[model samples]
Target chain A: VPSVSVHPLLGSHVVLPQEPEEHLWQGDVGTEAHPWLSDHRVHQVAVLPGAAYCEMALAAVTPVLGDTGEVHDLKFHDMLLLDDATPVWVSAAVTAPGTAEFGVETHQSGDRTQRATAVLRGDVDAERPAAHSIDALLAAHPNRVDGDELRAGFGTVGIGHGAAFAGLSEAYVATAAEPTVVAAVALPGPLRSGQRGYTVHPALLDACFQSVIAHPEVQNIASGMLLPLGVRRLRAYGSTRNVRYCLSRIVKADSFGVEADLELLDADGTVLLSAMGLQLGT
Target chain B: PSVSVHPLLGSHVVLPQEPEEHLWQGDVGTEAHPWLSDHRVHQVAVLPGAAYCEMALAAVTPVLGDTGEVHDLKFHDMLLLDDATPVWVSAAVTAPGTAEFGVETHQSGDRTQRATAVLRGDVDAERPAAHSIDALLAAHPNRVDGDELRAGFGTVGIGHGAAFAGLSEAYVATAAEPTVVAAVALPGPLRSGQRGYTVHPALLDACFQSVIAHPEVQNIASGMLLPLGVRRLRAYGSTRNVRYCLSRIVKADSFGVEADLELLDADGTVLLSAMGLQLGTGNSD
Candidate 1:
């Protein structure tokens, strides 16, 4: 039989007996455990966002890496639907040196299937990237995109981002010559998945992608809508429960598609998450 | 204090998981795990035969009441990966120890019997030793490489990526001998951080590669060896990055081979095994 272990953020969960060198922490998240998860719905199913996993990964490694930890190679294998009867559990393990590897899995008692996996790397004294001002970046583009228009565009692309995910209150773009767009996105409230730890929801991060589609230069890049190929160097420097903004610019565009850079910043212009390259293909 | 949270699939997966009853579920298309695109049949990308075989093996392993063997398996319909459908594999335990399993595409409701197997008894007790590892290796002493492995798969119209990527270092013992031996290793992951399949078809196919390593079948490169069915197939456990020694006998020759494969844990303990595989090579089509 396996023993149980408790986490600071996660109220109480089990520690599985797996690879000896690794620490496996498993727990179930739901409206009862974390009601805020119910607010972030996709297609009416309350799904855990990628950002939550990042926060969980960061929290799992803090004991070892302290405040300066980062997560890498966070590949999602499956979506965790927050249904009461079928609510899922999380298995987070610190395996790769200073990194913690985690996965979302499902099964009846004593038999679980892997849904996703990610690695966490920690640096106690790591420094943040050079910050950029949202006001200055949006000033380059005068046009503005409101929430309603952004939601409609997301619907067309089959991304049913609901209240928790619809973070873009307003967006700004530079003139036709300088096609940079910046959007101020905020969490609906100070969202909490557990007792205390909080970070930007992944849906909000996904909403940041809207800055590119809303850009006037979108028509010049492709005849159709652009789909995500992959995300490179997505880093989260610190946790945030405050309003944030994402600045996106089409770094390169050709007959194929566009490659852009998306940077997420806090209200004070501190870089929270920096996606160096968001490769999208038409 | 720890809480009594429910654990599905024995609690090793990291957070953000889903509820799925099937053994495996994923979107099989030209994109997302692109290697499935390489396996083309009549210009339509179809799931490779080895994939079906592996699915069958995996599905039956649990129901066998212990380690189970695949037996009398048949392919009913073509499960195409290019059909733009999310496919899934499942197994239904029909009897105390036997299981009936199949794979299906979601949208069109297309379905096919991947394979079936019967469980003999509890795992550790059914260890029936029949062949000596030393003699099987001595008879078939020929080395096999990647190119020839690709050629062998090409003859059968199978072009796959790292998943179906065939033999790393393989050997051929003796073809006509009462008992045969071949050495093989399940290939490592193609992409970084990729997990090993519970029962990878590529590993199963690599074992079949040794069957064609016979000297009489040198010209057999132009045709494909279709597995008619499997019987007395038993599985011990899930394996990865491990070496296996396959030994076979020409049970009855319509040119089909009956083989036994064993995956050994470094200490020479048999971890997994399979017996009575039915395969054929000569085809006019």
Candidate 2:
């Protein structure tokens, strides 16, 4: 048997500002940049001094979601759309925010998905409510949005906006603003693609998470929204190209300001994808 | 402590040369057919065709009327020569038992490396292409000492040159990867994990096989079974405003098969997201 050595991260969280931004320097050893993160195009918009705002353009990819090659489409939908962009921004916040929680919400604009409400706790300005499409509720306040009186307003609302911009897929058909009790939609082709014969775009797939991007603090952001993802056993023939993936339960809403769930799966679906929770520790 | 070699497909080598004459029958000693008596054995060749074949050489002895010792064998000596005309070479000593003798070849070159050896002679025509020493030895029990302990030392030659270096390889599935270095034994802490975080025994076994077989170029006939985790794992080396790419997973479209892969890098404001986190060493060697 091969011996292993687990290296614990030794660092405090670094808070980020309220504006959409991603630190240029983030990720862990053996980490690589995925191509989807490039095509999705993240921007570091300066929200204020010492803080910045970054956004992932999920809407940029719509027609290509059904491309050939299981791995390629996997990279486009996964590495390009979610994995590459989310982890970079998330890792940056973990490095600076010390200890904080974040709410990731996806926005859909008809046919595209856009992410906007990924926020670092310390970076938020409580006194002055954010003056944008989304609003953050502060502690003990009857905040009104579009005439709706919201009590105990301290959290932001753009968490679901990215998915809205990307347009609703079979994976999530309900509105991003659905209440916690509302049933969410699931990806039609499975959490992951079911085509084993197709090739995944190497660049897009590469962006799937080239490094160990999670830290304790970063993991905390996913705490409340976390739940043990579901598992399954499935086998497909030439139709699905014998693709396999896991369908994890929505432990909680994604925290990186995107409204999505991480569902891992294998090609045969004979096993639950996240059953073991083995992160791709690069 | 001492060490030993567990040959995967055993050792193999290839020798290409012209034969001085043709023959219908061959003999090990003493009596020879009329066809073989007229030809001269100029060069010696050893190629492991069916499986890994081994012999011990205590010392070199002079050829005696085509009945005695032919050529000398050394510890580091790995001969790759002609095949159709097999030349017998061994140095059996006055003692009854066999001496420590091994054959492993690693050819280093400017852009490639080649590893070959001479194993079992039995051929399983049923599976003509099979090059597994294990399978070959199964058929020739008398010639091979299945239980005999074997060991040796060699070097690692890079840049297309194959050398026998004391190194190990590790493989991962998907983007999930664990380092596969041999010099560094598996750390104890990793072997012992938290109540719910123990490493899978299967993973450990896969890691050992990865590092060991990465050195054998020709015996690749001993197929490599990649770990699922190995296909999922990825490694990056830089921190920049960009998105991380997950590499090493099985690609959907491909003309050939591969054991390793890399994700392409992305550049963007997410590059700002790269402001923190660990990076990898860029070199693959």
Candidate 3:
């Protein structure tokens, strides 16, 4: 039997036109290949979520930087809009112009840039930062907004996420030392376990980002849409399933937008996904 | 129980008196929307006309269903979102029963009207006679791929990121003609969400991009050829899904270009028709 992509977006796996030096891989995306994408929408348009970018970033750099390597300075240019009418073509390339540097851009179209681009590095040995206790954070954030209300809050801020992409179960907020929101972000049922053929499911990663609605800085609901721009850095410490606690702490927020640190943790306080400099614009 | 929303518009009903009058409100800008980040006028991020069409369609979806037509749409001006605060967007249906609606926004207490149009339910319009794409290529013989077309656009100051830069295949006359036959592809994820939009912004922008390929327009055209609006626009539900479709420049001139566009399915039936879709060249708003 032919090997298939565990994650539809991770591959069409047709290593593009033998540009041996610049390793390139191509894939096709649409409702036919990954119907779940059909459930993900931004501005009411079914689009490839940012998490898919994270998954593809991991898949691309893993070949050259190793599976444990991390991504940094991630930037998104033109977004990849998914449609069933025409198959959206995507490509990922890993080029080592020099040691300690791997340039990975997902949409490596010759004349134009597509989707997300990032810098991949292998040295995780830079003496990591200490982890925090999500339990204490939740306790401090005594204000709790349940799943139904949380979904409603998203709508108030000019976002209408379909049921399939609804991953925020509950939220906790506190006007403590630093404004922060801690919430339980989960994998929508059916994808309750494992990566489900993906290094990471896009839905789970998006729920992590969606936890921001609980943050106090955004309580000024009178404002407009709260949307993610990109992350300064992102790393995954292996993959887990079911529900995970997300701790989003505001780093700096003014009248314009807010910047924060996001951590997806297991029940034991194990880090599953660590994203820093997460920027949310109003 | 909470805030009610209309999916695409990112809008919620406020003091909706219905049939009498109502406002569906939301805001858009480059700061947060990931897709609009690179869709800019050089460095500044400006909302595209396709977004205007979507807002009009989304505002009327509840009354008109997924399939709706946006008529006499005029892009009076471009709205700047970056380097500024998020503008408050309002889709106002003064007389809910009437076919006409207006779109306006405000920022820091200043009111700005960006676009206006008439919204109607889908119409069963007849498809035009099939113009063979094969015949087009056979007669013209000049072809431009995605790279070449985008490269040409850049020289003229139409800098577009991938999603906004969507021309895949284009054919023209042996020498020069206002008309350029273009083939644009839709991304996979958005295929299922087709009905949610009046017409996807990127796809519509592709039609406008086709104008840039014409040798005559480039030489005589000045500044960026932004949209004024379509004289008449129509959209319909496709009998069969199409991954891509063809666009032809029905007419062109130094002032602007007009396109007669119709999307077809595998059965080659009409999916959409935009006649007398006009745009003008202007740099200074």
Candidate 4:
């Protein structure tokens, strides 16, 4: 196994850079091996964050794509909660020209189970969507929230982001006309160190989903905690080691679940990352 | 046509409540709900120990006619998170005035047992002997600042900021009793919107924070503490934004600690008391 810190997002984990597409990366997580798991709690269970899924895909493809690559149709079928007993593995394989299929998997009873799957594209950038002023977006939303409220709301859904995962600086919800919400997220200083060189940090991308709950439709469900169930057609236009914000519009919603389109935008309102068919469930 | 409120413990659909017991059943896996996604343990995400406690609390609460306490929670086997499996939870009066609750998983098509827990607790017992918080506070002199607390917690993979806003003051209460004590407050309001919890696992996990707060303990900070199981764990009442105390006694040199923890109301009344929590630990880099 060749050990390379090529992807700082994956710390200390040794990657098998020998074979072309069959390369794999393995790491152990729990309160012991990776203390950072404690900070990423949902319902008090130390779960692998969605941003982690993005990070793993980025890291797996980095062997071929280097630092700048885009993740598409990154759908999470099942969540991988990092238990002290078992470790997880990430691997990427080239299926077509300039494209790779990456997946996260674990084994049980001598059988491998796929937790999530995604498509990685090399040297491709999504077209930037027209940017909206942050001030104007906040002004459009009737309800505005600070960090404290964001933390509380995220906590209910079992998404616990400490200082490291604290990407959303300001959150707001549009209860006026169309059901929508927006969050102004900035990558924290400490996290920027590990995510340096990568265009879009997975944690920052994951934080973009936080504003979904601010919608009155989601808030109405008293005991329901909304979380990312699946994502499709996700495209990254540009990468950043600095501040970024996300805007989400409700595509369709019902009492049981919801679907929305989310865009990660830069300060100038240019869309950096766009995701459609983002699913949220109670 | 029925919905369940317990997202972490896998209660998706509510079965008709029978006269004998209260049964809530659901599937256990990441596809079940996003919150269940958080309970992963490496390769397989098992139901959290705290969640079993929550299921027991929810099961027994209606049986007891109010929010009650959990006792001697024993986890027999780990229930691997599987999409094709269905978990059934039942709470019935095994003995007069005492509810015996359990969780069992069955194969999708067949009824092969996967995991089981015989959880027992009481809601009618008299309040436990009260300990003076003032006296206990004076005995332990060791203190940990917020920065140290955050750093210490980071070592154990517990980094939920405001939700786990943990450990106001921690001390070694060896003088009054051989235990580690720390003060904690619940985050202003939980996102769950349940108003209160029997004792949120995060808060209870923070109770174990007192154990690691010691200098002698942190000297071996490289080691990790994994919750094995709990015994005689009891909750007096529902808990919310309340200040409380945590006490832990080191049980063995192999690095295991037993905890007796509680949250207090404004009048110094104990809201929740979790007792005899067993945690496993060993030296790790």
Order by lDDT, highest first: 3, 4, 1, 2
**Better model by TM-score: candidate 2 vs candidate 4:** 4
How big is the RMSD of model 2? 28.5
Task: For all candidates in order, state the fraction of native interface contacts they contain.
Answer: 0.21, 0.00, 0.00, 0.00
Best by lDDT: 3
Candidate 1 lDDT by residue in tens digits, B1-27:
343311111222233323322243435
TM-score of chain A for each candidate? Answer: 0.73, 0.20, 0.83, 0.80
Tens-place lDDT digits, model 2, residues B144-234 = 1111101111121111101111112222221223111111122233234212111122122222223222222112322222121121111
Residue range with the least summed lDDT across 10 consecutive positions in model 1 chain A: A9-18
lDDT of 4 by residue, A76-136 (tens): 7666666665456566677776788777776654556777788888867555677788778
Instruction: Judge candidate 4 against the unseen true structure and give its global Cα lDDT, from 0 to 1.
Output: 0.60
lDDT of 4 by residue, B1-285 (tens): 122345444322211223345455445564643344444434345555665666666555555655556666665455666654456666666665577666666544344333233444434567666567776667777667655776655566544354445557777743335566567765445445433346665566556556666554554334455455666556665666556575655453446555566666545677666677666542121
Reference-based TM-score of each model: 0.44, 0.18, 0.45, 0.44
lDDT head-to-head 2 vs 3, winner: 3
Tell me which of candidates 1 and 3 scores higher on TM-score: 3
CAPRI rating of model 2: incorrect
Model 3 lDDT per residue over A230-268, tens place: 788877766756337888878876667767888787776
